[PDB]
Design a protein around this nucleic acid. Structure first.
Ligand SMILES: [Mg+2]
Ligand SMILES: [Mg+2]
Ligand SMILES: [Mg+2]
Ligand SMILES: [Mg+2]
Ligand SMILES: [Mg+2]
Ligand SMILES: [Mg+2]
Ligand SMILES: [Mg+2]
Ligand SMILES: [Mg+2]
Ligand SMILES: [Mg+2]
Ligand SMILES: [Mg+2]
Ligand SMILES: [Mg+2]
Ligand SMILES: [Mg+2]
Ligand SMILES: [Mg+2]
Ligand SMILES: [Mg+2]
Ligand SMILES: [Mg+2]
Ligand SMILES: [Mg+2]
Ligand SMILES: [Mg+2]
Ligand SMILES: [Mg+2]
Ligand SMILES: [Mg+2]
Ligand SMILES: [Mg+2]
Ligand SMILES: [Mg+2]
Ligand SMILES: [Mg+2]
Ligand SMILES: [Mg+2]
Ligand SMILES: [Mg+2]
Ligand SMILES: [Mg+2]
Ligand SMILES: [Mg+2]
Ligand SMILES: [Mg+2]
Ligand SMILES: [Mg+2]
Ligand SMILES: [Mg+2]
Ligand SMILES: [Mg+2]
Ligand SMILES: [Mg+2]
Ligand SMILES: [Mg+2]
Ligand SMILES: [Mg+2]
Ligand SMILES: [Mg+2]
Ligand SMILES: [Mg+2]
Ligand SMILES: [Mg+2]
Ligand SMILES: [Mg+2]
Ligand SMILES: [Mg+2]
Ligand SMILES: [Mg+2]
Ligand SMILES: [Mg+2]
Ligand SMILES: [Mg+2]
Ligand SMILES: [Mg+2]
Ligand SMILES: [Mg+2]
Ligand SMILES: [Mg+2]
Ligand SMILES: [Mg+2]
Lengths: 41, 206, 122, 26, 179, 149, 14, 87, 97, 46
RNA sequence: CUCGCACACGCUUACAUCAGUAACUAAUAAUAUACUGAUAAUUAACAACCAAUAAACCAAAACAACACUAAAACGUUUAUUAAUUACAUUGUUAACCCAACACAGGAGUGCACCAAGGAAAGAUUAAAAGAAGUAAAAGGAACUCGGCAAACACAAACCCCGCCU
RNA sequence: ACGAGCUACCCAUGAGCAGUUUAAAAGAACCAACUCAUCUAUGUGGCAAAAUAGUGAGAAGACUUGUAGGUAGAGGUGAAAA
RNA sequence: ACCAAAGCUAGCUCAACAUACUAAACAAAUACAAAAAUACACCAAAAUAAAAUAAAACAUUCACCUAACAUUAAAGUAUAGGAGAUAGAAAUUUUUAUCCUGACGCUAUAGAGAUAGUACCGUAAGGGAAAGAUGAAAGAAUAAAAUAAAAGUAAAAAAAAGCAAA
């Protein structure tokens, strides 16, 4: 029974929504964005 | 000529070895398999030329003559009935000749009609007492003929004229055979008076 | 990396490589080094006179086909040896020892075209 | 392809939201 | 006699040149050996003519006139062949009783495959023949292993062809549950 | 005959005969200029010089003076969609030369009927007239010309 | 030692 | 083209030679005697269905050989394509 | 991370189909059946797995013992290597010793 | 001096070293052919 | 400005004719020997294939007169048998091969030094630095690890180590 | 198992070496073809996974070189540089 | 708005059964330099598996490791071992038919390497790919229909000062 993550989209959105107003590539790329958001909080 | 088709292939009403076909599905095309209800060749009750009724579509309750059947996808074509329109003649300045064209039908949407009362019926294969195999209606309890139809050549045997290189019925049906135990070689060589003496030296086979 | 797939043909190698395309040898190498043909190895075509005979490459369309019966060793036995054998058994002249009068051949090595080792091409 | 209804449905909701964002209904 | 390669000049530029049906086997079983022998050449001349016309059509970038003839003729000749063959193969079954006109034997080659080995004509007997003598019909012991592998591979293929078909059924039964 | 076994010849054997020949022949138009003596065939790969001479003389009654053959190699270069090579098959070409001074010429097998070509030019003028008829009127400016008013 | 890494090409179909 | 004769191209040293070197005091031809090779026998040609050719074979030989000979003699005397020939 | 844009065809499973309705019917065959057949007998499956269970190592070991000589070459070889690997791993590796 | 041109083609050498006959003249060669057959190679040998 | 023509080996139609090239090959175009399609083509006299067994022969190739030392590739004749009878079979294109490339590299032989082959510059401008060249007042190794490189020079001597090719 | 079509050394069998100097085809001399690879500058993802330009060393020999064959990894081959 | 995105099929996996186990196809040609009809011969053969590894080194030893005998127990017992690591029986016991075969297995980076042992890479043994998605009909392409959501860009260059935010 192979299980894959189907909803990964929303997982990503819950991070990215906080990053929209950043400058640069931080506001797009989940990697950079995750870091920047954590620093933001 | 036998053109061998790829194992996975779609049947598009275009003759499989033709320009329309090579253009629709080029050398490397593998599309999704269309599920087809399997039917043994002995359970197949629809031929070409027989009057049938359409149970589905925009034209329904109508009746027409079956022109072509496609057995691979289980299809019939009732001429000038199931229909949609398409242009044929084309050049840059001119779109010519809008022609009504036929969309094929599954054999579930078409019921075979018995000649007498012109109603649609459920055909069932029966063996009669003469060693004959005929279609028998379930509802009306009659036998339905089979649709004698012209052939792909457009050549009718009744009206025909023998050319220079054609052999007449007479000379063709003539039996000249005298079933005797010599081969073609011995026969011909005897007939042409060819005289041979010598025999072959021993040959080793392995 | 040379060529593995393409077939091996006389065109491909050195001067020393000559491999025929599969025509059959008509002779042998003689004394002078010159080649000698043997008139017997060269196939002689046997061609009948076609002029006075009526049959054509095609057949009339209204002319019927027939029920297809592949010739069997049995049918050939019955169209040939059966009337003769029946005629000579009914007269009691039948001889199980020599069937040769009916067309049976005990051994093939005498006659020109033999069937089993198959002496003839066509 | 991934096997399930859930994500598909949940996405249908997003499709609807965008459809309403790009053309607001009167 | 060189014009037998071309159709009668009356036919040259024309689109459709009509023609009869090819010979059935049955129609030929009625003819004698001599007449078949002749008909063979009648058909041959026509086949040559048609092949010529074919190539010459390709050369002119034009479609060949009524290409179907070439089919018919071939079938005819083919059919004719099938007939004469019968009369021989029947006949030898009577005289000799061998089913194969060429002597041959079941052998086992170096690769351990079971092969049908056709024989060859030689002026000298087999034990005096250098070239023939250095062939090997038999397998060495190592070959056994590979033979096994062959079987297994084969078995697998069959195994999962079968399972495929079975599956195709189930699918269809849930697609068209008219039962 | 081809694809068939031939009986091995030893000394003092019968004359080998082929009753129904297997071969087949195309008379072809030369790609290059050739003397009137010369006819050119495409034959099967396995047919010898001698074979073809006898073939011509016996079946067609052609007085053959001399025969030469060569083997044309077909290109293996063209590739499939799978990038597999396709082979145009090799073939054998035969030049024959006629004996008695008989001249040949390769006949024109496709003379054009003037009536069918005039019917083609008339059908083209009629098609051009139909496409000139359907062509939009400059002054209507793209208003559909179906409606009376 | 003399250390050398021979370059490796990519598949031609790419 | 001469090729369809048949004739074949080849390349190797081109010699003009009279039957002797230039330094020889005998510079001129009288007669030649050519023995026809075996392949060209009247019998063999008769078997090949070449009748007329019997004559041709002779002609050709002369026309070549003699030409060559004469030509060579001429070039021993210093004549050539641009000097043509006086006698 | 793109998600399919179209609703899949809704799959309707009827729970009342034959196999589901009759499920687990003879499981008590021993108790109610005056013990003759143990419920093991109801197990359909691989010959070495009927009414028996074990960690992957034990499983492979047992498969080899039982059907080992009926196996294809490649599969038997793979089975041996698997066993050697599992042996080495379970016996010599781990946190807990 | 410069390298990479190590392969200098000869058909005689090719077929003597890697050819069908050469592969069938020794038991090991036969095992090569057998392996290739097993893998289902299009070309068993040169 | 000058690596030309041919053969061997190798390559395998990449050659030829007609047409097409929006894009694909050409490291760019024009167009086309290299991309695409259709149609054709290299014709044997050259080359490959093309006898065995006995027996007599000590006497080099070198312009071979005669010799040298390292002692040398290459056949006649005699005898015994060798199917005997037109036309067998096969190689014949190319601008080409080995180097991942339409690679300044690697490639045997025969003839040639031109009669054959080819084009260093896509268009400008005329900065630095870099590369390659020609010239240079007076001086002439003061340079530098060393006259390295260069030069209108193209010579002489002496050591160390290895005798020498 | 596979490899000596590169290269090391062999075996068969072919092929090249012009001019000049010398009684001399003497592992003599000058100097091409040919074979090497001295010194420098370029080049350093290059024209090139070892080249280009100049300059050099040998050049009738322990010479260069074509074709076919041999020796195989505990091995081979080696005018030893592992 | 470009580049793109989304399908559900191709087939696979694991078992069950099963007869029994080298498929299919053979006209010619195939062991001359495989695919080349045809000339006095030769032909053939076997010798213990080893080591990586475990023993925290390594030297005796080190299950399994291409040899049919399964199962429940006896039993990890007797025994064997640098008596260490580890290895390890047997006597003796148990085993009830045949049908109910399928799937809390994969769904195109998964499942077979596989559209294929092909292309391509190697002199050779050998290595070994990638790739599919319209509809009832395309004999419905002035073509009709539902995502327009990754990074990358475009629509729209920038304006003192600084982990870019708070
Ligand atoms: Mg290769
Ligand atoms: Mg060759
Ligand atoms: Mg050659
Ligand atoms: Mg001859
Ligand atoms: Mg020839
Ligand atoms: Mg390499
Ligand atoms: Mg190439
Ligand atoms: Mg071209
Ligand atoms: Mg371009
Ligand atoms: Mg040439
Ligand atoms: Mg420039
Ligand atoms: Mg400057
Ligand atoms: Mg400077
Ligand atoms: Mg200067
Ligand atoms: Mg100065
Ligand atoms: Mg100083
Ligand atoms: Mg200083
Ligand atoms: Mg200097
Ligand atoms: Mg100096
Ligand atoms: Mg000085
Ligand atoms: Mg020294
Ligand atoms: Mg070598
Ligand atoms: Mg000299
Ligand atoms: Mg010297
Ligand atoms: Mg240099
Ligand atoms: Mg300089
Ligand atoms: Mg120099
Ligand atoms: Mg010097
Ligand atoms: Mg010196
Ligand atoms: Mg070798
Ligand atoms: Mg060691
Ligand atoms: Mg050693
Ligand atoms: Mg050395
Ligand atoms: Mg040392
Ligand atoms: Mg050292
Ligand atoms: Mg250890
Ligand atoms: Mg450890
Ligand atoms: Mg250690
Ligand atoms: Mg061990
Ligand atoms: Mg002890
Ligand atoms: Mg210890
Ligand atoms: Mg895959
Ligand atoms: Mg894969
Ligand atoms: Mg984006
Ligand atoms: Mg700030």
């Amino acid at each position: 029974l192979r299980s894959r993550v189907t909803d990964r989209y929303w997982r990503v959105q819950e991070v990215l929504k906080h990053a929209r107003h950043f400058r640069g590539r931080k506001n797009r790329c989940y990697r950079l964005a995750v870091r920047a958001v954590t620093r933001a909080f | 000529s036998k053109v061998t088709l790829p194992p996975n292939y779609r049947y598009g009403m275009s003759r499989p070895g033709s320009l329309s076909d090579k253009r629709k599905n080029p050398p490397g095309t593998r599309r999704r398999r269309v599920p087809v209800e399997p039917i043994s060749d002995e359970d197949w009750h629809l031929f070409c030329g027989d009057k049938v009724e359409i149970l589905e579509g925009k034209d329904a309750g109508k009746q027409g003559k079956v022109v072509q059947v496609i057995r691979q996808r289980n299809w019939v074509v009732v001429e000038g009935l199931n229909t949609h329109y398409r242009y044929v003649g084309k050049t840059v300045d001119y779109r010519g000749t809008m022609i009504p064209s036929e969309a094929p039908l599954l054999h579930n949407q078409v019921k075979l009609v018995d000649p007498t009362d012109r109603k649609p019926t459920d055909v069932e294969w029966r063996f009669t007492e003469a060693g004959e195999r005929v279609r028998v209606s379930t509802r009306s309890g009659r036998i339905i003929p089979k649709p004698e139809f012209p052939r792909a050549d457009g050549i009718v045997p009744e009206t025909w004229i023998d050319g220079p290189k054609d052999t007449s019925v007479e000379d063709a049906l003539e039996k000249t055979y005298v079933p005797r135990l010599k081969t073609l070689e011995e026969e011909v060589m005897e007939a042409m008076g060819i005289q041979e003496t010598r025999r072959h030296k021993k040959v080793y086979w392995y | 990396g040379a060529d593995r797939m393409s077939k091996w043909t006389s065109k491909r190698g050195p001067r020393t490589f000559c491999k025929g395309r599969g025509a059959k040898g008509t002779g042998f190498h003689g004394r002078d080094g010159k080649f000698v043909q043997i008139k017997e190895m060269i196939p002689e075509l046997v061609v009948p006179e076609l002029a006075g005979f009526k049959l054509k490459p095609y057949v009339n369309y209204r002319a019927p086909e027939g029920t297809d019966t592949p010739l069997t060793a049995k049918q050939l036995f019955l169209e040939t040896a059966a009337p003769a054998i029946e005629k000579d058994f009914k007269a009691g002249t039948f001889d199980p020892e020599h069937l040769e009068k009916y067309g049976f051949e005990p051994t093939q090595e005498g006659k020109l075209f033999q069937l089993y080792p198959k002496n003839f091409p066509r | 392809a991934k096997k399930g209804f859930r994500a598909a449905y949940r996405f249908q909701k997003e499709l609807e939201r965008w459809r309403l964002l790009r053309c607001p209904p009167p | 006699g060189l014009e037998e390669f071309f159709d009668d000049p009356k036919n040259w530029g024309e689109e459709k040149v009509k023609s009869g049906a090819s010979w059935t086997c049955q129609q030929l079983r009625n003819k004698s050996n001599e007449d078949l022998h002749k008909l063979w050449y009648v058909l041959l001349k026509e086949r040559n003519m048609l092949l010529t016309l074919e190539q010459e059509a390709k050369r002119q970038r034009l479609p060949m006139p009524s290409p179907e003839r070439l089919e018919k003729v071939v079938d005819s000749m083919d059919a004719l062949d099938k007939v004469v063959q019968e009369r021989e193969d029947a006949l030898r079954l009577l005289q000799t009783g061998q089913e194969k006109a060429r002597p041959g034997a079941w052998r086992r080659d170096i690769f351990g495959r079971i092969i049908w080995h056709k024989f060859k004509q030689w002026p000298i007997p087999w034990y005096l023949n250098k070239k023939y003598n250095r062939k090997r019909f038999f397998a060495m012991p190592y070959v056994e292993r590979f033979v096994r592998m062959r079987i297994e591979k084969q078995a697998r293929i069959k195994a999962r062809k079968r399972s495929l078909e079975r599956k195709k059924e189930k699918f269809l039964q849930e697609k068209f549950p008219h039962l | 005959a081809r694809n068939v076994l031939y009986p091995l010849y030893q000394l003092g054997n019968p004359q080998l005969r082929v009753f129904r020949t297997n071969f087949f022949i195309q008379l072809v138009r030369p790609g290059t200029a050739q003397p009137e003596d010369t006819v050119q065939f495409r034959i099967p790969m396995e047919m010898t010089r001698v074979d073809l001479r006898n073939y011509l003389e016996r079946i067609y009654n052609v007085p053959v003076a001399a025969v030469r053959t060569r083997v044309q190699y077909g290109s293996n270069r063209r590739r499939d969609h799978r990038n597999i090579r396709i082979k145009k098959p090799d073939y054998k070409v035969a030049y024959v030369q006629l004996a008695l001074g008989q001249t040949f010429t390769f006949p024109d097998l496709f003379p054009e009927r003037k009536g069918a070509s005039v019917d083609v030019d008339v059908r083209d003028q009629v098609l051009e007239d139909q496409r000139q008829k359907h062509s939009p009127d400059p002054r209507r400016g793209g208003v559909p010309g179906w409606f009376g008013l | 030692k003399k250390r050398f890494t021979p370059p490796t090409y990519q598949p031609k179909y790419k | 083209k001469p090729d369809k004769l048949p004739l074949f191209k080849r390349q190797y040293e081109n010699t003009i030679f009279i039957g002797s070197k230039t330094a020889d005091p005998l510079c001129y031809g009288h007669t030649q005697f050519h023995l026809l090779p075996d392949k060209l026998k009247r019998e063999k040609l008769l078997k090949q269905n070449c009748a007329d050719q019997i004559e041709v074979v002779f002609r050709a030989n002369a026309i070549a050989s003699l030409f060559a000979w004469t030509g060579a003699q001429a070039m021993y005397q210093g004549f050539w394509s641009e000097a043509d020939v006086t006698r | 991370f793109h998600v399919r844009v179209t609703l899949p065809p809704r799959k309707v499973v009827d729970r009342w189909n034959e196999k589901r309705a009759m499920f687990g019917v003879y499981d008590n065959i021993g108790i109610l059946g005056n013990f003759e057949k143990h419920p093991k007998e109801l197990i359909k499956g691989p010959i070495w797995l009927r009414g028996w269970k074990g960690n992957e190592l034990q499983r492979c070991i047992r498969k080899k013992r039982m059907v080992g000589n009926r196996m294809f070459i490649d599969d038997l070889h793979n089975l041996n290597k698997r066993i050697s690997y599992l042996y080495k791993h379970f016996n010599r590796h781990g946190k807990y010793r | 001096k410069a390298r990479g041109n190590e392969y200098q083609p000869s058909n005689i050498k090719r077929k003597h070293k890697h050819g069908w006959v050469r592969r069938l003249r020794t038991p090991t060669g036969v095992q090569v052919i057998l392996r290739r057959m097993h893998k289902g190679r299009k070309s068993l040998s040169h």
